[PDB]
Amino acid sequence: GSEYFTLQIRGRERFEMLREINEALELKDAMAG
Amino acid sequence: SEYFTLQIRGRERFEMLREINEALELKDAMAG
Amino acid sequence: SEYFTLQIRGRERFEMLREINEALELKDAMAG
Amino acid sequence: GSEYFTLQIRGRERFEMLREINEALELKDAMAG
């Protein structure tokens, strides 16, 4: 299975941007299986 | 400022998002 | 709405940003 | 040299987010040469 990694992000706005991207990529993951 | 953490699935995805993240940090630093 | 264009240098970078872009579109569509 | 590609982006906020990312990546390009 996938290994998980943690990224340190500077700034709330940047965090929210990268979090939204990550959440979207994970939704794509869910449709693949 | 306290920094945030984001947990990412997959090495390639992590490396991509890390590259983006660090490039954004560089852009801030180069502006001054 | 009129959509925007962004010009990107490099196939790998383009594919990465396109994947992100389309995943965001999917997230919108799945919310309703 | 690099080939350029155009991406169609839906929504101004998303455009600004991806544009900022792209601009940052290109700045990194400039420091490599």
Author numbering:
A (entry chain A), D (entry chain A): 324 to 356
B (entry chain B), C (entry chain B): 325 to 356
What did the original publication write about this model?
The p53 protein is a transcriptional regulatory factor and many of its functions require that it forms a tetrameric structure. The four domains include a central core DNA-binding domain, an N-terminal transcriptional activation domain, a tetramerization domain (TD) located just C-terminal to the DNA-binding domain, and a C-terminal regulatory domain that is controlled through numerous post-translational modifications. To generate the tetrameric form of p53, two monomers form an initial dimeric structure through interactions between their β-strands that results in a two-stranded β-sheet as well as hydrophobic packing between the helices from each monomer. Next, two dimers come together to form the tetramer, which is stabilized by a helical bundle that forms through a series of hydrophobic and electrostatic contacts between the side chains of the amino acids located in the four α-helices from each monomer.
Surprisingly, we recently determined that the TD of the tree shrew p53 protein (TS-p53TD) is dramatically more thermostable than HU-p53TD despite the fact that the two TDs share very a high sequence identity percentage. In comparing the TS-p53TD with the HU-p53TD structure, there are two major regions where structural differences are observed, and these differences occur in areas that contain the three amino acid differences in the two sequences within the structured region of these p53TDs. The first difference occurs in the region around L350 and Q354 in the HU-p53TD, which corresponds to L350 and M354 in the TS-p53TD. In the structure of the TS-p53TD, the side chains of L350 and M354 from the adjacent monomers are in proximity to each other and in position to make hydrophobic contacts with the same residues of the other monomer within the dimer. This results in the formation of two hydrophobic clusters, one at the C-terminal end of the helices in each dimer. The second key difference between the TS-p53TD and HU-p53TD structures occurs in the hydrophobic core, formed between the four helices, that stabilizes the tetrameric structure. In this region, the aromatic side chain of F341 in the HU-p53TD is substituted by the aliphatic L341 in the TS-p53TD and L344 in the HU-p53TD is substituted by I344 in the TS-p53TD. In addition, the sulfur atom of M340 from one dimer is 0.5 Å closer (4.0 versus 4.5 Å) to the nearest methyl group of I344 of the other dimer in the TS-p53TD than the sulfur atom of M340 is to the nearest methyl group of L344 of the other dimer in the HU-p53TD. Together, these two differences help explain the enhanced thermostability of the TS-p53TD in comparison to the HU-p53TD. In addition, the results demonstrate that M340 in the TS-p53TD oxidizes at a slower rate than the M340 of the HU-p53TD under these conditions, which we postulate is due to the increased stability of the TS-p53TD relative to the HU-p53TD.
